């Protein structure tokens, strides 16, 4: 999944995939996983600063039948199997349940959305 609206303060990439590391000392300061693990610093940030990992987790509801308690992986297998060609519009639960994610990602091809925007 991509951290929509978030840009890395060291390499400047935005809407990046992977884990997001937020500094709890610097104002509005985030690093992508690569910059974090490599010890990148910019402006007033130091590697001693505590950081919060923001990311995955979660159980999700299938938008087509309402069954609950899927992981991201198990949701995709369930959808790509039992809801294969359904053209009914639904809102993505993964996008809505993740921080900064799109609260109303409407899609009429959920299986394809999962494969392209929620890669495992």
């Amino acid at each position: 999944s991509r951290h929509e609206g978030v840009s890395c303060d060291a390499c400047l990439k935005g809407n990046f995939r992977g884990r997001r590391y937020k500094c709890l000392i610097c104002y509005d300061y985030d690093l992508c996983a690569s910059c974090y693990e490599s010890g990148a610093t910019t402006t007033r940030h130091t590697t001693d600063h505590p950081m919060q990992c923001i990311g995955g987790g979660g159980s999700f509801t299938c938008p087509y039948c309402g069954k609950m308690g899927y992981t991201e992986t198990s949701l995709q297998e369930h959808v790509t199997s039992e809801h294969a060609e359904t053209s009914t519009e639904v809102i993505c639960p993964i996008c809505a349940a993740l921080p900064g994610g799109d609260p109303n990602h409407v899609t009429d091809d959920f299986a394809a959305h999962l494969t392209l925007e929620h890669r495992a």
């Binding site: 929509e4 609206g5 978030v6 840009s7 303060d9 509005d28 300061y29 985030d30 900064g100």
Partner: peptide, 4 residues
């Protein structure tokens, strides 16, 4: 940076 978070813009939202």
């Amino acid at each position: 940076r978070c813009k939202g």
